[PDB]
C-alpha cells in the first residue's frame, strides 16, 4: 500500500494518461466442450520502462459428469472431472517476458482454543482440559503452478466433498467394509448399479455445470527489440477420474482411480505489437 | 484486480468515452404467466477489438404453487415449481458469439472443527475427541448450465427446504411410516386432504410470490462482418412437480413425481448491429 | 455486477446527461387513516429507447391495533393488522407497460451443522451424534406478488411474534388448554377481560404504530405513441384479524379469525408525458 | 436502491444546480429544561413541482432523574423519565403538507434454532431435542407515531434495564416478596430509603442525562399557492413515572406508576415561502 | 439520513464556497498537569441564516496515578482519577447561543436468549429453560450531561475494572472479608503496604497515562448585533479518589472513599467575530 | 464526526490551496541498532492561525533478544526487549508548542454474560447461575505517557505472552515449583542451560526482530515570532530484562529481573521556520 | 491519519503534480527456479527534500517438495522449503539510503475469556470456573528482519500445519514411539517408504508450489551528490530441511532435520539517477 509509506495513493500505478487498445477472442471447442475466451488489453505508457499486455483467460470447462459404463446392475462406472488446468507458454525462441500474475498462492490461518476447567462437588474435585482447532477448507483448491519466465499455469483441484450431509470424503479415502463413498446415493441399496449415484445436483456445481476461470496474466517486450512479432500458446485441460460401485452381495462398494484421463485444447495465438492486435 | 497487478485500476477496462445506446423490450406471456423483459446496451468502443451487445434477462417467473386435484377428502395432490430457467441461443449460421456471462458458478467453503478433551475426576479419568461440520444450504441453488458459443442458459434448482421449524427436507427425501413430508401441514390430521397442505406464506418465497432472474450475457460480433444482422431467441421454462397427499389409514401419507410439467414460452429478438436497435 | 464483465462501471446505466422532471403528490384518507404519498421521476433519455416514469409508493398505513370489542368482563375482541399491501395497475386498453418493479423476492438460507462425539470412561464407551439448524425470522416478510404486464403488488405479511420472551406463537398456533396465546398478557389471570391484552409498546412497532412502504416501479412509455395520456392507480390496503379472549371459569383462551376485515384505499391519477407532469 | 433499476445513481434525488437557504433557531425552556434546535432548509428546485423545507428537530430533553420527595426513613419517591416524546404540528387551515419524515419504522427480526442429539452409553441410548431463540433489545425504543397530513410525531419509550447485571426488569415486573426492583439498589437493606435507589450512573445514561433528539420532516407547499406563509407549531415533552418503595419490616418493596407527570414545551415558528425564511 | 428523503447527498449541509479561519489555541497547566487545546473554526455562510464557531476542545488530562500517602506498613494510601470532565459556559449577558455539540448520548441494547430443551433417557425424562443474556460495558463511560443554553459539559466516569482476570470491580463493590479490592495486588500479601497495589501498566491506561478529549461544540451569534465581542470560559476540571490500604492482621483490606479532591482551570477565552479570530 | 453538526465534509480541515515543503531524514545507530528516521511536513495555510509542522518518527527499533551469558549446564541468562520508547522534546526556553499526536490512549470494552438454567428429572429439580467475562488482550500494549506542552512521548510495553500454547505468562507470573516460566523451552528437559531457551521464531515477532513505531506530532509556532529557528530531540530508549533459568534439583527455575539495561539515543535536530527545512 | 489530526487527508503525501518514471526487470534462475523481478518507480517531487525510489520485490520462489531420497523400501527421505528470504541491502561505501518498508512486525492479539458457575441439585451444591484463550496462528509468518541503514530484509518462516485433521504439527513437534510425524501419511502402513509421504495437493500450497514476495522498499538520495550512480544487491533464498521416514518393525518413525540446504540467487542493479532508469 503507497499510503502506508506516505506516497500518494495511485502515485505507483500505470497506465495512466495513455490510450489502450482492447480486444477480444472467443473460440468453442465442441470435442472437449471448454469454451475459451481471451480478453487482452494492450499497454504502453511513455514513462514505463517495455511494453505490456494482460491477458485474460476467462473461458469455461465443462464438467462432464455423466455415467458412462452399464456392465449390468451389478456394477457400474462414473468419470467427474478431479482437475481443471489453464496454462500459457510462450516459445523459448522468443524474447517477451512474463512479468505477472493473479490470484497467486495465499497463507492459510487457523484457529486455536485451549481450556481448563475446575469442578468441585458436595466431595469431587474433578479437572478437565480441552483443545479445539477449528478452520474453513474449500471443495476446490485453487493452485499457482511454479511460474517461470516462460510459462505461467493455474489447477483447481479437488479437496474433498461433503456427502449426504455426512463428513467430507477425500478422494483417496477409504473405509474398510463400504470402501469410497464419494458419490454414493444409499449404502445398503437395493436400485440398479447406474441408478445409486449421487445426483449432480446435490453434488457441488464445477463437477457437473463445469468451471469458469477468470487469471490474468502480463507479459513485456524490449521497446527496442528487433522483432515485433512473438506468438503465445493457451492450454486448458481436464482430468477425469473414474469411480465405479460394485455390490459384494451385502452392500454397496466404491472404487476410485485417480487420472484416469485427460483432454487439453492447446490454442495458439499471434502477437503483434507493432499494430497492437492480437489475432487467431 | 488491476491495482493487485500495479495497472491503475480501470485502465483495462471498456466503454470509456463512447455512446451507448440502451431498450427496455419488455413482453409478457399470459398463458403461462411469465412478465419477462430484456434490456440491452450496444457499447461500441472505438479501441475494442469487436462490437459489444449485453442483454439484461431481467422478468419474474410466476410460482404456481396451487392445488390442482380434488379427488376427494381422502387424496388430492399439489403442483409446485422445481426449476426456473431462462436461456439464450443463437443459431448456428451467425457468426455473432457469446463471450461473459456475470452469474457463474462458484466454490463453496466448510467450516471443520476438532477437539479432543480429558479429564481426571479424582480415582478416575475421561477421554473425549469430536468432530463438527458447518456450511450453509441455500433453499434455491442458482447455477449456471454448461455454456458454449451460441448458447448459454441458466437455472434455479430447489435444494432442502425446512416447514414448521423442523428438519429440512427435500425433493428425494422419503419416511417409511409418514413418506416424503416436504408440505405436509399436520401429521395425524382429520381435515380435507386438500386443505391439508402448508400454507403458501409459511413456504419459501420463490414457490407461490415467483422468481424474478437478473442475469447478463454479452454478445459480440466482428466489426466488418458481411451482414449487421442476427437473430436471437430468450427462452423462459419452468418445471413443476406433482405432490401428492392420500389416508393410509391412521397417519397421512406424501409422494413426489419429480418434473411432472414443463411451461416453455420462448420469443425471438431481431439484432441490428448497423442502426444499434433491438426488435422483438 | 456491471464490472465483472469488464465493462466500466455505470456505463450500461442510463439517464447521463438528461434532465429529469421530478415531482411529488400526498393525499391523507381520514376515513382509513393511511397517509399516502407518490415521488415521481421522468427520465428521458435520447439515447434510450422509450421514456421511462420512476414511481416511489412511499407513505404510512395505521396500525390500527385497539380492543374493538367489550362483552362484560368475561370475554373481549381486539383487531389488529393480518397485513399491509400496496397495489399499482394500469387500464388495459393503455400503452404503457411496467418495466421494473424493486423491490423483488430473494433466496433464503440456513446453517447447518453436524456433530459428532466419542468418549471412554474409567471400562467404558460413548457415542453421540447430532445436527443442529439455525435460520432467521423477520416479524414481518415484504412479499412481491407476481407482477404482470399492467399490474404489480407487493405485500408484507405477519410472521410468528416473541411474545413475553415465549416461542414464535405464529397466526396459526394452537394450545390445547390455552388456545392461541398470540397476544395474551397473562394465562391464569383475574382482572377484565378488555384490560387484559398484550401492551401496544410490549408488541411490533408496525402492528399499532403503522407501516410505511417504499417500493420503487418504473412504466415505460414508446416514443412514438399516438396517445400520450395514461392512467394509474395506487391502491393500499389492510386486512385485519380479530382476537378475541374469553374465560373458561379456569384461564384465559384466545382464538383467531384470520382476513375479519379489509379497507382499500385507492385514488387514480393522470400522467401525462408531453407536459412530464402527473397529477392527482 | 435506485442503482437496482439500472438508473444512474443520484438521477431521481433532487437538490441540483439550486441555491439551499439554511438556517437555525435555538430556543431554551429553563422550566422545563428542553434545549430546542429547529435548523430548516429551503430546496428550491425548478424542476420539482412544488417547494420543500426539511426541519430537523435536534435539541435535548433533560432526564430530570432525582427523588422528588422523601417521607421518613421508611418511604421514598423517585421520578424517571418515562418516554420522551418530540410531536410538529401544523394548522389544519393552511394548505402546506407534510411529505416525508425520518426515521421510520422497522421491521424487528430473530434467530431460530434447533437441536436434535442422540447418543449411546456402554446401552442407555437416550435421545435430545432442544431449541434456542434470540434477539436484541435496546433499553429504549424509537417509535414513530401514526402520521397523518398536518401532524407527524415521534415517541422513545421505556424498553426495560439490566439492574445490578441481573434480570432486565421492566415496568411491569412484579415480584411477590419484593415487587418491582427497578431501581431498586439493595434488597436486604438496612439504610435510608432516600438513599436506596440505584445510581444514576449506573442506570442508562437517557434517564439522568437527557435524551438529544434527531428528526426530520421535509413539507412541501404548492407552488401557485395564494398566499406564502404557514405558521408550525413543535412540542417537545417527557412523561415521568412516580416510582415508590418502602419497607415491610423484612425487606424493601418498590411500585411503580405509570406516566404521572407531563410536561409539555410548545413553541410556535412563522415560515415565510416567498422570503424562504422563517422565525422564531 | 438526507439520502433516505429523496434529497441528494450534501445539498443540506453547511459550509460550501465559504473561506473558513481556525487556530490552535494551546496552553499547559503545570500545576494541575492537563495539556489545554482549543482548535476553534469560524464559519460565514452567505446563505446560512447566523454566524457559526466550531470549538473543538480536544487536549489531554493527566492521569495522577499514584500513593499519595504512606504511614507504615500496617496501612498506605492511593489517590485514582475517578472521572474526568470538561464544560464550556458564555456570561448569562452575552448574546451567542450553543448551535449543536457532539458526541451525545446513545442507546445500549442487549441480546437475550432463551432455551428449552427435551431428553429421554434408556423411563427418566428431564427438561430445562434457561436463559442468558449478554453485554458489552466499557469501563469508562462517557455521558453528556444535560446542556443549557449557555454550558455544555461532558464526563467520563469509571464504570468497572477487571482485575487480574478476577471478574468487574466498581467504587462500590464490598467483600465482606477483603473489602473493596479495585487495585489490591494480593490477597494474602505479605511485603509493604505501599508496594500492594496494582500495577499502573496491569491498570487501564486511562487511570496513569491520561484521558485525551476529542468533543465539539458549535455556537452561533445573530450577524445584525450590536456587539460582536463574546467571552468563553472552559474548565478542564478532574476528580480523584482515595483508595486506602489496611492490613487486619490476616488479609489485606481495602477501602475506598468517593470524590475526595478536585482540581480545575478555567481558561477564559475572548471571541471576535467581527476579525474572526479568538483570543486566548 | 463533523458531518453529523451538519457541516460540509472537511469544512473544517486544514490544508486547502497551499503547498507543504515535505521531507526525510534517515540515520542509523550502529551501537544500539535503532534505524530512526523522521518525515516532516510544513503546512502554512493563511487561513490559519500558527504555522504548522508534523514529525512522523517512523524509525525501527531493534529487539535484541539473545541469551547474554552462559555458565556451564547448570545456569543461563537471556536479555529481551522489556518496552520500546520514543518521545519528542523541546527545549525549556523555546517558543513553539506540542499541538497534536495522533496515537492516543484509548477505552477498552468488555464482553460480559449471565446464565440462568432450571432443570427437573424424572424428580431433582436443580439450578445454575453462571457469569460469563472475556475481553482481547494484545502481547505488547502501546501507551501514551503524559503530553506536556514541550515534550510528547510514547511507550510500547509487554502485556503477557502465550508460551506452548500455554497460559499466557507475565513478567510478575510466579509459580512456587518452576517460576517464571516464561520464556522456557521444557519444564524438566535434559539439555545444556543456555539450549533451553524459548525459540525467538515461537515467540512474538517484536521481541527479535524489533519494534518499528508510527507515531505522529504536530508543533504550532507563532508567525510573529522574534526567532524562527527551534531545536528539536527526539529518542528512542528502549528497556531490557535478564531472564534466567536455574536448575535447583531435578526441574529448571526460571527468575526475571525487569528493567535491567537501558539503552537511548537521542539526536538533535534544528528547525528553520523561515526557509520550511528541518535538517541535522 | 492526518484526519485525526484535524489535517485534510493526503495534505502530507508527496508524489503530486509530478511525474514517476517507471519500470519493470524480471529474470528467471534456472538451477534455483526462483522466477524474480523488481518493480521501481523514480518520484522526483519538487517539494520533497530527497529523491526518492520505490523497489518492489515481485516474483516467485519454487516450493521444491519432492522425495529427494530413495533407499530400499525402509526408509526414504524428503526435502521441503522451510523458509523463504528475500533480501536487498546496499555497498556500504554508496550514500543512498534505506527509507521505508511497506511489511512490518505487528502485534497479535489474544481472546481471553472467564466463567464461573454454581449448581444446586434436588440436596448437593457444586462450583465450577474456566479460563480458555483463542488466538489465530498462521502455516507461514513472515517476519522483517531487523532492519537497518544499507541492508533490509524480509524472511517467511514455516509456523504450524494440520496433518490429516489431527491437531498442529511443527518442526520441534516429538513423540516417543512414531516421533515428528510432520509429513506422515500413515502411521503405520505396509506401502514403500517413499510411498508414504503426505500428498503435495493435501498440505500447504506454499511448499509445494511456491511463495510470490510483494515486499516494497524506498530509498532516498540527497539531491547534491557528486555522484548519481548508485549499485544495489538483491538476494532471494530458500532455506531447505530434510525430513525422513524409518521403519522400527512395529510403525513407521520420522525425524526431520533443520537448515539442511539453502539456495541463494544474488542479483546486482545498477540505478542512474540522472537519468531516472535502473539498467540491471
Same sequence: chains 1, 2, 3, 4, 5, 6, 7.
Avoid at 492459510?108 to 469442578?119: A, I, N, P, Q, R
Avoid at 517486450?221 to 515485433?228: E, G, H, L, N, Y
Amino acid at each position: 500500500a503507497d499510503s502506508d509509506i506516505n506516497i500518494k495513493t495511485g502515485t505507483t500505478d500505470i497506465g495512466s494518461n495513455t490510450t489502450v487498445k482492447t480486444g477480444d477472442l472467443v473460440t468453442y471447442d465442441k470435442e472437449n466442450g471448454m469454451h475459451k475466451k481471451v480478453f487482452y488489453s494492450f499497454i504502453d505508457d511513455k514513462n514505463h520502462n517495455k511494453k505490456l499486455l494482460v491477458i485474460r483467460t476467462k473461458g469455461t470447462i465443462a464438467g462432464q459428469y455423466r455415467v458412462y459404463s452399464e456392465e449390468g446392475a451389478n456394477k457400474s462406472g462414473l468419470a467427474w472431472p478431479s482437475a481443471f488446468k489453464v496454462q500459457l507458454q510462450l516459445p523459448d525462441n522468443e524474447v517477451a517476458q512474463i512479468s505477472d500474475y493473479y490470484p497467486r498462492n495465499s497463507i492459510d490461518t487457523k484457529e486455536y482454543m485451549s481450556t481448563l476447567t475446575y469442578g468441585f462437588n458436595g466431595i469431587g474435585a474433578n479437572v478437565s482440559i480441552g483443545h479445539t482447532l477449528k478452520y474453513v477448507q474449500p471443495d476446490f483448491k485453487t493452485i499457482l503452478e511454479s511460474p517461470t519466465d516462460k510459462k505461467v499455469g493455474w489447477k483447481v483441484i479437488f479437496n474433498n466433498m461433503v456427502n449426504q450431509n455426512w463428513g467430507p470424503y477425500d478422494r483417496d479415502s477409504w473405509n474398510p467394509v463400504y470402501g469410497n463413498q464419494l458419490f454414493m446415493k444409499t449404502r445398503n441399496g437395493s436400485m440398479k448399479a447406474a441408478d445409486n449415484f449421487l445426483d449432480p445436483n446435490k453434488a457441488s456445481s464445477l463437477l457437473s455445470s463445469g468451471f469458469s476461470p477468470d487469471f490474468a496474466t502480463v507479459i513485456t517486450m524490449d521497446r527496442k527489440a528487433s522483432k515485433q512479432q512473438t506468438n503465445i500458446d493457451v492450454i486448458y485441460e481436464r482430468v477425469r477420474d473414474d469411480y465405479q460401485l460394485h455390490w459384494t452381495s451385502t452392500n454397496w462398494k466404491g472404487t476410485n482411480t485417480k487420472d484416469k484421463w485427460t483432454d487439453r485444447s492447446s490454442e495458439r495465438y499471434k502477437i503483434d505489437w507493432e499494430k497492437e492486435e492480437m489475432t487467431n
